[PDB]
Design an enzyme around this catalytic site. Sequence first.
Site, mmCIF file in Angstrom:
data_model
loop_
_atom_site.group_PDB
_atom_site.id
_atom_site.type_symbol
_atom_site.label_atom_id
_atom_site.label_comp_id
_atom_site.label_asym_id
_atom_site.label_seq_id
_atom_site.Cartn_x
_atom_site.Cartn_y
_atom_site.Cartn_z
ATOM 1 N N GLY A 22 50.867 -4.857 81.555
ATOM 2 C CA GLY A 22 50.388 -4.444 80.248
ATOM 3 C C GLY A 22 50.223 -5.613 79.335
ATOM 4 O O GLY A 22 50.817 -6.671 79.514
ATOM 5 N N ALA A 23 49.354 -5.426 78.349
ATOM 6 C CA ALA A 23 49.082 -6.455 77.359
ATOM 7 C C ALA A 23 48.815 -5.773 76.039
ATOM 8 O O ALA A 23 48.082 -4.779 75.957
ATOM 9 C CB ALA A 23 47.893 -7.310 77.744
ATOM 10 N N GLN A 25 49.296 -6.412 71.415
ATOM 11 C CA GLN A 25 49.336 -7.286 70.283
ATOM 12 C C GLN A 25 50.552 -8.183 70.177
ATOM 13 O O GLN A 25 50.465 -9.297 69.643
ATOM 14 C CB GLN A 25 49.361 -6.366 69.122
ATOM 15 C CG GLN A 25 49.215 -6.900 67.817
ATOM 16 C CD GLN A 25 49.089 -5.721 66.898
ATOM 17 O OE1 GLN A 25 49.047 -5.888 65.706
ATOM 18 N NE2 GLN A 25 49.027 -4.510 67.469
ATOM 19 N N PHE A 26 51.675 -7.699 70.700
ATOM 20 C CA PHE A 26 52.901 -8.475 70.590
ATOM 21 C C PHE A 26 53.272 -9.193 71.865
ATOM 22 O O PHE A 26 54.352 -9.809 71.953
ATOM 23 C CB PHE A 26 54.043 -7.559 70.167
ATOM 24 C CG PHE A 26 53.743 -6.761 68.945
ATOM 25 C CD1 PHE A 26 53.304 -7.392 67.795
ATOM 26 C CD2 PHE A 26 53.870 -5.372 68.963
ATOM 27 C CE1 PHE A 26 52.984 -6.649 66.645
ATOM 28 C CE2 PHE A 26 53.554 -4.611 67.835
ATOM 29 C CZ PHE A 26 53.109 -5.256 66.670
ATOM 30 N N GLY A 27 52.410 -9.076 72.873
ATOM 31 C CA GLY A 27 52.699 -9.738 74.126
ATOM 32 C C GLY A 27 52.293 -9.019 75.399
ATOM 33 O O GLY A 27 51.522 -8.053 75.384
ATOM 34 N N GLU A 28 52.959 -9.411 76.493
ATOM 35 C CA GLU A 28 52.651 -8.871 77.805
ATOM 36 C C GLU A 28 53.878 -8.406 78.570
ATOM 37 O O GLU A 28 54.989 -8.822 78.286
ATOM 38 C CB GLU A 28 51.940 -9.945 78.635
ATOM 39 C CG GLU A 28 50.615 -10.432 77.980
ATOM 40 C CD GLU A 28 49.851 -11.469 78.805
ATOM 41 O OE1 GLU A 28 50.478 -12.341 79.456
ATOM 42 O OE2 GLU A 28 48.598 -11.436 78.778
ATOM 43 N N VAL A 29 53.643 -7.558 79.551
ATOM 44 C CA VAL A 29 54.698 -7.077 80.449
ATOM 45 C C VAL A 29 54.198 -7.398 81.843
ATOM 46 O O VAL A 29 53.075 -7.037 82.188
ATOM 47 C CB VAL A 29 54.926 -5.568 80.356
ATOM 48 C CG1 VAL A 29 56.013 -5.131 81.396
ATOM 49 C CG2 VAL A 29 55.418 -5.240 78.927
ATOM 50 N N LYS A 43 59.047 -9.096 79.815
ATOM 51 C CA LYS A 43 58.267 -8.862 78.599
ATOM 52 C C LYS A 43 58.207 -10.190 77.857
ATOM 53 O O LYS A 43 59.243 -10.789 77.581
ATOM 54 C CB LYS A 43 58.900 -7.757 77.737
ATOM 55 C CG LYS A 43 58.208 -7.678 76.408
ATOM 56 C CD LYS A 43 58.311 -6.308 75.820
ATOM 57 C CE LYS A 43 59.729 -5.933 75.545
ATOM 58 N NZ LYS A 43 59.752 -4.730 74.635
ATOM 59 N N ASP A 134 62.797 6.668 69.621
ATOM 60 C CA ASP A 134 61.460 6.604 70.251
ATOM 61 C C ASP A 134 61.552 7.326 71.598
ATOM 62 O O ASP A 134 60.927 6.921 72.582
ATOM 63 C CB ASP A 134 61.094 5.117 70.447
ATOM 64 C CG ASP A 134 59.588 4.857 70.499
ATOM 65 O OD1 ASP A 134 58.801 5.816 70.400
ATOM 66 O OD2 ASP A 134 59.209 3.662 70.630
#
EC number: 2.7.10.2
Length: 271
Positions: A22-23, A25-29, A43, A134
């Site tokens: 995943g990608a 706004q705050f980064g990637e996984v 992450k 959440d």
Amino acid sequence: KPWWEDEWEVPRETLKLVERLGAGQFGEVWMGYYNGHTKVAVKSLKQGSMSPDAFLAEANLMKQLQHQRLVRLYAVVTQEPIYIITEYMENGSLVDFLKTPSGIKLTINKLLDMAAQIAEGMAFIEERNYIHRDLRAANILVSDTLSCKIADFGLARLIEDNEYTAREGAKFPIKWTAPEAINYGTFTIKSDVWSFGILLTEIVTHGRIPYPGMTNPEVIQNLERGYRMVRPDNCPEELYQLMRLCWKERPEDRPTFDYLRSVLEDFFTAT
């Protein structure tokens, strides 16, 4: 503790990032390996996209909340780009898994089992005086053996007194959030119980969005009249009446997660 004394800090050279999952706004996984052989999720923080302190706050909380039913913190790399490394869950998020061919073939019994597993993780969070805030199917991860674990502790908080009060401007997903939190910004473990009821609808509908065919203002309007979500298609009535307990108006009248876990286990051992 400082990074040179911290049990979780690891040299970046110990990690090989293999596949991006995943990608944002705050980064990637990414899926990757630690020391060649151990599969992990990593992450990464996109430098400048958000505070590194805010980013690491999640890892610090995870150091205090360790249990078989919660995704485990593995390590951290605190030099930019900052990484948080965690336990890898082969089947990804529950909301996505329930839509795959394997997910679609699950029996109501297995779905009730998974529901009880999640209630068991949340009973631990409850007993330790934390809240999650959440709780939804997107934030439950599924293992290769079809066991489930609570994930995404970014909004989780240690509750000193019965309640956590957010920021007037802070916004939460209306369909999963308890009324008191939407209205006052006040969260307790009972707000998570509300969310759990919504999550149970996601499980029984194989990941469908709650309150079908309704906008957020419509959901709010209906809740205020005393209505709750319409019975999902093919949802057992015992399960629906359990969701209703989670949606009681007064937070204090909602059940505990230990109660929810106990009932869901009975539903499973019956089915």
